[PDB]
Symmetry: D2
Subunit: 393 residues, 4 copies
């Protein structure tokens, strides 16, 4: 909407810096625009409210003498939205300095249990005949309302399992159990300004469904930029820090173009067509654009056993399956151990895979320089010889 | 030395609450337990860096009894107990027995202070006496004390550093394993793990070997370590480390030691590297890994070498360790096969492959395959999901 | 309901290795243990967020035995055991008894898979007239199962979220490292939401709540309330001897000098005395001197008190302070160190 | 040898994403960065443990260029670059420049593999000659490589161990501070911190001091360390450590340097221990501590001793460091200081003060 992608990215980049970068940021961009950007981001981070009684939390973003006042309406079963100053009972004033709020949302920072904000309970309540009866009405509501808003004003790791039920995406709960693995592999990336590409947005031909996992990744990586690729148009999903791209997963040249434009990627996820040949095309085309230390993730390898997706009944005939790829990746890892051959060159994947993690219906591939060196030729090539050479006479 | 059953029981109770610490110190003689802890501390101290030799007095206190131990600390030598007069005593360190038990073998949070008492230059009566000793001993006492105290706790060691300390080829020259081991193993450090490593080291050399067993002992403060080797390795044995003599290719014998000493949280194969041996040991010992545990295969490079029973062609993997790992991918996905699963099928939940080392996760593989009513064709799936 | 000493024995054994878990299952009846785990599971489950009511079957298996439990899971209502008839079973969840013990009360690493079995729509015959049921129960069964599964583990909860369901960021900082221990927690001053909060946060814990009023209705698994006078030093010593020693004591200001003097001695070394919300302020200041007492000039006339010898840390925040129990015996600065600045310069310059 | 502004810029860009690392390598000569990283690695290497001396070749690669450094590695000697002919080359270690940047100065997750390339016994032609050298060099090579590689990353060091290594009294004889420092400082380690320690060490002695400065440099891989001392300690200055000469009891002077070098994430007072000095420094420097930062006071023991402006009576605390701490307790429950203290942590002879607005949980008193 208002917020240009390069600008959001620049803001996140500077927010991760020290004092000089924070000053630089607020000098480079209008403080009113930045405060607007933070509110939009906060509205996305807030968990569902639990309070039965509608309440207003006032979020005051302060910069020098300027106060950008946002009155957030908070109630169970309604998205948290900004309203007019008079449109409810202000249960809590929450105050942040602009640079502090930037650090909390987009910074590289340590946990801060206190000292980031100021709060005042029932800020506009005057001592009247109505006062005490109004305190009974609102005390719990103000507390719960505030909890929800405060949780949106920071970068505490969300629970992926919970986000999958919240954003309506099949990662955990019924058909799959991916999220605890995703958590283990992804959580160490959360300090970084990651670029994440997911192939397959969701909902298929439905004019409204999809983008659940995309929103999941936005919540999980507070400093990330998420991209979604789908053969269908999913522009209705675009929001702050989420970009949807329309194209074919099995078009390698096109994959190369978008990776050049938007890459390189810390993380690529394949959850698209699940057609076996597609997975192989996507991987060969997109693995070179994963950063060293990044991950390439393949979901739903179950289609490797099925003809309707270009797979095979017999698990042994894994010629062109996604499982065949995984198996071959083991040899790619071990490639420096092959008997020397003056004609053979290690392929690109050979040189660039350093780990493979395989779980039920999900596999993680580690991108890295695979150049540890094979076992020297002067270590004997049979067991009884090795014993002799290792027994120190 | 100390009976294994006793050592394991002490570790068990040290991991409990106040009632268990009482039970422990009433079941066994406090004098006996003190010598056990000191033995442990000796193997736990990092190598000292002080140039001038110093004594750290460790006094272990229980009730009215006070057990005094004098540790000689100097660089290039191992820390060892000596008599009270056999050096300058730079530091007195005092522990309650139950507190020392907690720090060495407990299930405990990190405690930055209040676990001990300390008295510097303890036997220097007069001030003028201490002043003349600052030049010679202040630094030395500080460095010596630092090393002993490191031996008196449970702080996680650096496995890559241990590789160099204990002369094991796990990191730094032929291999680069230790960062993978750290990632996979560190969350077990609380537990009274039982670890089996196949291959003690040294082969037929009469002295060498056991470096990796000493590594695991350091890394797992509450663990029992077992090493298997075809050659006698009795000289490696020490508190919390037992060597077993036998053939990793004898499936009956492996069942025997598994039943005697298991079940294992962790098994590591770093033995002959003969492809068949690797397969025999996996089939025999995998059933004896606890759910949530790990089976680790090292040095799969031999999969490509016929002198180890491997094949030069990676596609001809039917008899190799790599062929096994590939078969394990199918095991993980087994419930996705069209319409009995074997033991391994039902019990593998993760595979991690790195250069020359693979970790296998033992667990109930029973998430359920993709249900019948989900379409088995791409075109069919698209219309059903809209 | 369940015998306290038994519950503690179960939790003690659950935190061991294989021989302790088999001891557990031999020592006590597997059906009893089963009801205890379910009882515990119901206390941990988050409030469900699914609109269409669904049943989750929890099958607990020990050898030849199988204990089934059908749990009603719907929004705005607590998860409750029900009869198999009284709703639609959307998910079967299956645990080995010993594995569930490990997950709820064990000392264990995080295990992202392999702890259970799952069968989606466990009792559906064919697809000829049973797709209409698939169309409305798919999303609810996923959300309902997510809530049950969260009750079946020991994932650290959010104390902020627990405060709403039943400030806290400082409690998390100081309390979280204790979570795999079989702690004993005493809260002074108790609605018993606060005790239910610590129960949730300490999966292996025993919680005790002291109050002058009878609060026996608050009692449940791993929560006992004690009734008596918080201003009576002797009584406090007596209940500490009985139920202690405590890893953590939480003392509300709404007094303190009395309860702190009587109870600090019963805090475990490495434990915490927590003071929430004049009287309190003065005590905190003095604790600074208690920490520094080995630095006082010597006097055979003044001798260090219990607290002096036993405090190793003070953490003071807005309306809450944490006092670290431990041996305060590091040694004071030795006499041979100069006691004015100019002399310290000289003696420290080679 | 390296410009302090340039180093801080390099650390800042290193902690960014791909486009920042590209920017880094365009902005500065890659040769120069190579020397800077090697310099950094040399101070991060633990003491080596190999008996037989060995050479570890560090090759840093950018695009086409290859910068080769040969490091001598032997017990009791510091790792230093020497010619290719001054020993046996045990190991070739190879880094892409931007990858090494990331490993040393980046904001990065832990990477157990794929950050480098390694070639053992790299200049031995045939197999028969290499077998000859197993008995002499293999173990030496492994141990040497391990020491170098330890200095090529950012693994949290052990402060207690650094205390013995760098000769500072923070742990092991007079004090037991380091486990507290570790708990309070460890979460700051991926931030480009600015650390100011009052008291460099060594006093009038012409060589001693700097121990603790080197400690912080080692502990904070992206940090800039500053040390203030009344005496001149210019011999201590190295990459990422600057020493400043001046009096801690000169409020105006402190404000002057706090504006030049601040704001600080951490300030540590281990200076004169004169009680008035401690209170002057705090009042002057606390305003320049960043929100979420720490002010640390060491050696409050002098609060009891008149020779440092203290008092034997713990109740006569009005002008002592203890008295200051006690009034910090008041501020936390309600001057600049009052509105900006959110936490106090007191341990034997060391206190940690948390900086942040004590503005939270306000209620209308009526
Ligand atoms: C020929 C091949 C053999 O090389 C040796 O035996 C070298 C022995 C050295 C000479 C020893 O150093 C001596 O220690 C003395 C105490 C003082 C000595 N000196 C300083 C007086 C000092 O020189 C070692 C003890 C040093 C440590 C690093 C070590 O354990 C090395 C083991 C090397 C094993 C390989 C076989 O590896 C196996 O097969 C495959 C290659 C792989 O599968 C691999 O994983 C493994 O399973
Ligand atoms: C007399 C008091 C003075 O003692 C000294 O000066 C002792 C100097 C040693 C003799 C040095 O060792 C020498 O290093 C040579 C390079 C090789 C030498 N050898 C092996 C050939 C070797 O002997 C030190 C460098 C060793 C390290 C541990 C160190 O830094 C010790 C500092 C001690 C400072 C105290 C004053 O402390 C201050 O005042 C308060 C008491 C406290 O508040 C305190 O915190 C502090 O602020
Ligand atoms: N060849 C192809 N290229 C790109 N996208 C494709 C494709 N075939 C199918 N898709 C898209 O991939 C999606 C599969 S569903 C993706 C689920 C989503 N990632 C989530 O977790 O919520 C569908 O929306 C479909 O439109
Ligand atoms: N069939 C067999 N059964 C058991 N051990 C065997 C074996 N064949 C060889 N070994 C042993 O396996 C060892 C391999 S070396 C072990 C190295 C050790 N893990 C370390 O890292 O330090 C040798 O000591 C050898 O004696
Ligand atoms: N008024 C003053 N201003 C600044 N520095 C002072 C001072 N009075 C003394 N000092 C210096 O403070 C230092 C105290 S020793 C510092 C020890 C060092 N921090 C370490 O941990 O190793 C001495 O070097 C002394 O010269
Ligand atoms: Mg999917
Ligand atoms: Mg090996
Ligand atoms: Mg000092």
């Amino acid at each position: 909407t208002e917020f240009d992608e390069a600008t959001v990215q620049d803001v996140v980049r500077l927010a991760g810096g020290h004092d000089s970068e924070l000053r630089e940021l607020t000098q480079k961009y209008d403080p009113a625009m930045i405060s607007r950007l933070l509110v939009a981001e906060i509205l996305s981070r807030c968990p569902p409210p639990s309070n039965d009684t509608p309440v207003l939390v006032e979020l005051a973003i302060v910069h020098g003498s300027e106060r950008f006042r946002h009155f957030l309406r908070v109630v169970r079963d309604s998205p948290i939205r900004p309203v007019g100053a008079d449109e409810g009972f202000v249960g809590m004033l929450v105050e942040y300095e602009l640079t502090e709020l930037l650090r909390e949302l987009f910074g590289v920072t340590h946990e801060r249990p206190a000292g980031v904000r100021g709060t005042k309970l029932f800020p506009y309540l005057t001592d009247d005949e109505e006062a005490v009866e109004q305190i009974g009405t609102y005390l719990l509501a103000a507390q719960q309302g505030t909890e929800a808003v405060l949780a949106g004003c920071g970068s505490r790791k969300p629970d992926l399992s919970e986000l999958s039920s919240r954003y309506f995406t099949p990662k955990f709960g019924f058909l799959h159990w991916f999220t605890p693995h995703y958590d283990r592999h992804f959580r160490d990336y959360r300090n970084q300004q990651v670029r994440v590409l997911e192939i397959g947005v969701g909902g298929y031909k439905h004019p409204e469904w999809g983008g659940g996992s995309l929103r999941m990744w936005k919540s999980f990586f507070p400093r990330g930029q998420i991209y979604g690729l789908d053969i269908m148009d999913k522009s209705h999903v675009d929001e702050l820090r989420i970009r949807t791209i329309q194209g074919d997963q099995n078009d390698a040249e096109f994959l190369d173009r978008i990776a050049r434009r938007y890459g390189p990627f810390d993380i690529v996820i394949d959850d698209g067509s699940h057609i076996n040949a597609h997975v192989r095309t996507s991987f060969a085309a997109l693995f070179p654009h994963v950063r060293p230390g990044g991950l390439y993730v393949i979901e739903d390898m179950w289609t490797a056993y099925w003809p309707g997706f270009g797979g095979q009944a017999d698990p042994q005939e894994c010629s062109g399956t996604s499982l065949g790829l995984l198996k071959s990746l083991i040899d790619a890892i071990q490639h420096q151990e092959l008997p020397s051959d003056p004609n053979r060159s290690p392929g690109y994947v050979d040189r660039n895979i350093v780990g493979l993690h395989v779980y039920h219906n999900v596999a993680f591939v580690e991108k890295g320089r695979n150049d540890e060196g094979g076992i020297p030729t002067w270590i004997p090539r049979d067991f009884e010889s090795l014993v002799q050479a290792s027994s120190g006479g």
